[PDB]
């Protein structure tokens, strides 16, 4: 007796200790304590469709993210008022669009950290089982591609306008290998190529992120150059140059758990297929986590 619906969700956090941090107090005036009885309820022999590319939960999140946008991200649970309930998909290798066998009724979503970043998704949830390629329409190269990794790679950023990020080159190459492999499955065993972004918006062409009050804009050219896929001086630590901008020392490490990609058109009659980092906007960062959830009215 459920139908697809949209309702004003409310946030719930584990915010405590009345800190000076802005991200935490915001979860006291606008949010509520986390549910002490977080129980799921499996649906017997129920199969239903999903579509994260039309999920209104993403819009409500963003709007709530903007409010605090007007320091460290903390997990936020999105719940429903009386009369509504959240469905949750547990098909492991579900690409975020289509029928879902393993549906379960949850009261709220898990703890999601509103990490704002571009190109690379940080501190997100990892894909169980295999790597998952996500898109509203893969055949349409204009539609965003969300790569959901199943093994995180640490990025260690340091600030001596000067800054740089350090990544284990050997590990990143292993991951990208499996990314190309999984991409190579969708198209037709075609040659998968990664390339740096050309001219465009600053958000699309460089890895942007925050660090307790520091806005980084890192150069991810070395990360997506096929000099290290398939040896040379690639093993060891890659040092990505970065820069600070105001729109002693300090360090911040993060989990690379996903990648936003854009596939190149035109190259349709060739044997290869090119991809570049950066794509979509901030809403897709939330969409990378809210893919399994969907609201329905009772």
């Amino acid at each position: 007796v459920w139908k697809d619906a949209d309702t004003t969700l409310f946030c719930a956090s584990d915010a405590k200790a009345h800190e000076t941090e802005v991200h935490n107090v915001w979860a006291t005036h606008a949010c509520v304590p986390t549910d002490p009885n977080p129980q799921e309820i499996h649906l017997e022999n129920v199969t239903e469709n999903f579509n994260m590319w039309k999920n209104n939960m993403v819009e409500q999140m963003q709007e709530d993210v903007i409010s605090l946008w007007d320091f460290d991200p903390i997990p936020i649970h999105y719940c429903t008022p009386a009369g509504y309930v959240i469905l949750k998909c547990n098909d492991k290798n579900f690409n975020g669009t289509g029928p879902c066998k393993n549906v379960s009724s949850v009261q709220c979503t898990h703890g999601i950290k509103p990490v704002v970043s571009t190109q690379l998704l940080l501190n997100g949830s990892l894909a169980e089982e295999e790597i998952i390629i996500r898109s509203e329409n893969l055949t349409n190269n204009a539609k965003t591609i969300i790569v959901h990794l199943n093994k995180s790679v640490e990025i260690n950023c340091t600030r001596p306008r000067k800054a740089y990020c350090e990544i284990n080159g050997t590990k990143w190459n292993k991951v990208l290998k499996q990314v190309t492999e999984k991409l190579k499955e969708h198209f037709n065993n075609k040659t998968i190529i990664f390339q740096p972004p050309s001219g465009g918006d600053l958000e699309i062409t460089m890895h942007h992120f925050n660090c307790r009050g520091e806005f980084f804009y890192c150069n991810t050219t070395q990360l997506f150059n096929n000099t290290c896929i398939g040896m040379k001086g690639c093993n060891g630590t890659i040092t990505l140059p970065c820069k600070i901008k105001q729109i002693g020392k300090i360090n911040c490490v993060s989990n690379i758990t996903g990648i936003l990609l854009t596939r190149d058109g035109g190259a349709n009659n060739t044997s290869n297929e090119t991809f570049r980092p950066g794509g979509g906007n901030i809403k897709d960062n939330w969409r990378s986590e809210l893919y399994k959830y969907k609201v329905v009215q009772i």
Partner: antibody, heavy 135, light 101 residues
Framework: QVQLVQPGTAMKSLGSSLTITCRVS?????????????MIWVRQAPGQGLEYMGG????????TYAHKFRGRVSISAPGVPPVLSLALTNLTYDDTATYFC???????????????????????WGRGTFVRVSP | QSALTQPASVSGSPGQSINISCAGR???VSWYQQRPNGVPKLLMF???RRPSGVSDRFSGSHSGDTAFLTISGLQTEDEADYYC??????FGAGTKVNVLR
């Protein structure tokens, strides 16, 4: 609010040199700060058509030119905010023309339809600098 | 870096419809409108996509090898020089559109 500012006119004598500049203005966001956009120059002699003569991606120190203008012209963009420069040398009467600067929109996202565009076009143009080569 | 051919001139009365061909490259084509003594303005990109502010009277199209620009219901405001380009960049000769008054 963002605009490409050009001087306007340049009266030069035959055989002299000149450097036209194209600076961004009203850049509150700082979108041009890191030189992410490919910037070009375009020539248009009096009563003639537009001529793409080359450009540069300021994040790189590597300019590029059309065949006709490869060895005749020097393009660059140095500065904290990159200021696009076009250096002409030994001016001829054939160099008498209007010189526009323009941005290649480049990669960007279109929300209303949610489409990732390559942006191989020029949305933003300068007013143009008319260079007059006189005897 | 490829030569693109355009007809030198075309004219029409107010209300009529006209065509402007862009011979050679029907891939990633941009159109630019230059009114007299004015700066070139982006009219169309990616063959058929219109920037915000551009009237829907303008329409893009391709025919395999040649791109097209249609102007339905010509108006005096449309009198200008129209330039075509693809990638790699190389502007075509240009076409003068005269709107009879």
């Amino acid at each position: 609010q963002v605009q490409l500012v050009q001087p306007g006119t340049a009266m030069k004598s035959l055989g002299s040199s000149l450097t036209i500049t194209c600076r961004v203005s009203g850049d509150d966001l700082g979108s041009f700060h890191f030189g992410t956009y490919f910037m070009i120059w375009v020539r248009q002699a009096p009563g003639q058509g537009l001529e793409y003569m080359g450009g540069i991606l300021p994040s790189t120190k590597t300019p590029t030119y059309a065949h006709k203008f490869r060895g005749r012209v020097s393009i660059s963009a140095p500065g904290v905010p990159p200021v696009l420069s076009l250096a002409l040398t030994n001016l001829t009467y054939d160099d008498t023309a209007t010189y526009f600067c323009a941005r290649e929109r480049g990669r960007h996202f279109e929300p209303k339809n949610r489409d990732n565009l390559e942006g191989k076009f020029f949305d933003l143009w300068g007013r143009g600098t008319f260079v007059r080569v006189s005897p | 870096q490829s030569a693109l051919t355009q007809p030198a001139s075309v004219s029409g009365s107010p209300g009529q419809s006209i065509n402007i061909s862009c011979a050679g490259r029907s891939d990633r084509v941009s159109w630019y409108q230059q009114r007299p003594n004015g700066v070139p303005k982006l009219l169309m990109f990616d063959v058929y996509r219109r920037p915000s502010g551009v009237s829907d009277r303008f329409s893009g199209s391709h025919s395999g090898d040649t791109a097209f620009l249609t102007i339905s219901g010509l108006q005096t405001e449309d009198e200008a020089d129209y330039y075509c380009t693809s990638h790699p960049y190389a502007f075509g000769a240009g076409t003068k559109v005269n709107v009879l008054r």
